[PDB]
């Protein structure tokens, strides 16, 4: 058993909410819809998975 009654909570800080609209309202507080940005190229990503795959090219440790 575990505590869980806020399906719509900010997965960035302690803040939590039971409504999706409220979450969006709270998101305005952070002011920065750019979690990850590639300085090398300039691409913006909302997920680290894509960034990890993107780093694949930048992965300098085996040129050939
Ligand atoms: Zn937050
Ligand atoms: Zn890049």
UniProtKB/Swiss-Prot annotation:
Subcellular location, record wording: Nucleus
Zinc finger region(s), C2H2-type: 8-30, 36-58
Description of what induces expression: Down-regulated during maturation of dendritic cells by selective stimuli such as bacterial lipopolysaccharides (LPS), CD40LG and zymosan. Protein levels decreases upon genotoxic stress in a dose- and time-dependent way.
Organism domain of life: Eukaryota
PTM comment text: Phosphorylated by ATM in response to genotoxic stress. Phosphorylation induces its degradation by ubiquitin/proteasome pathway.
Tissues of expression: Expressed in germinal center T- and B-cells and in primary immature dendritic cells.
Description of its domains: The BTB domain mediates homodimerization. Its dimer interface mediates peptide binding such as to corepressors BCOR and NCOR2. Interaction with corepressors through the BTB domain is needed to facilitate the rapid proliferation and survival of GC B-cells but is not involved in the T(FH) formation and BCL6-mediated suppression of T(H)2 and T(H)17 differentiationrequired for GC formation.
Function: Transcriptional repressor mainly required for germinal center (GC) formation and antibody affinity maturation which has different mechanisms of action specific to the lineage and biological functions. Forms complexes with different corepressors and histone deacetylases to repress the transcriptional expression of different subsets of target genes. Represses its target genes by binding directly to the DNA sequence 5'-TTCCTAGAA-3' (BCL6-binding site) or indirectly by repressing the transcriptional activity of transcription factors.
Disease link: Chromosomal aberrations involving BCL6 are a cause of B-cell non-Hodgkin lymphomas (B-cell NHL), including diffuse large B-cell lymphoma and follicular lymphoma. Approximately 40% of diffuse large B-cell lymphomas and 5 to 10% of follicular lymphomas are associated with chromosomal translocations that deregulate expression of BCL6 by juxtaposing heterologous promoters to the BCL6 coding domain. Translocation t(3;14)(q27;q32). Translocation t(3;22)(q27;q11) with immunoglobulin gene regions. Translocation t(3;7)(q27;p12) with IKZF1 gene 5'non-coding region.
Self-association state and partner proteins as the record states: Homodimer. Interacts (via BTB domain) with the corepressors BCOR, NCOR1 and SMRT/NCOR2; the interactions are direct. Forms preferably ternary complexes with BCOR and SMRT/NCOR2 on target gene promoters but, on enhancer elements, interacts with SMRT/NCOR2 and HDAC3 to repress proximal gene expression. Interacts with histone deacetylases HDAC2, HDAC5 and HDAC9 (via the catalytic domain). Interacts with ZBTB7 and BCL6B. Interacts with SCF(FBXO11) complex; the interaction is independent of phosphorylation and promotes ubiquitination.
This protein's name: B-cell lymphoma 6 protein
Originating species: Homo sapiens
Organism lineage: Eukaryota, Metazoa, Chordata, Craniata, Vertebrata
Gene this protein is translated from: BCL6
